[PDB]
């Protein structure tokens, strides 16, 4: 029984989830997504 509980605790520890949340939040803050600016943009492209 204690062997099984230790095993399950080990897998659950390997099955944590908050770290990916933290990583995604950090990446979102770093990239600094935004929409404010002009209504629409006109750009230069040399279409093939």
């Amino acid at each position: 029984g204690q062997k099984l509980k230790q095993d399950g605790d080990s897998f659950r520890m390997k099955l944590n989830t908050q770290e990916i949340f933290d990583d995604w939040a950090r990446k979102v803050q770093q990239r600094n997504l935004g929409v404010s600016g002009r209504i629409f943009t006109i750009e230069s492209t040399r279409v093939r």
């Binding site: 002009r38 943009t41 006109i42 230069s44």
Partner: peptide, 28 residues
Amino acid sequence: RKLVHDKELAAEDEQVFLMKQQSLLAKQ
């Protein structure tokens, strides 16, 4: 004095209008 139709509706090709408005966006 039979009147003739005046200047027709112009096209003002998309490229020129886009360039003018790109300039206006750049200056604003």
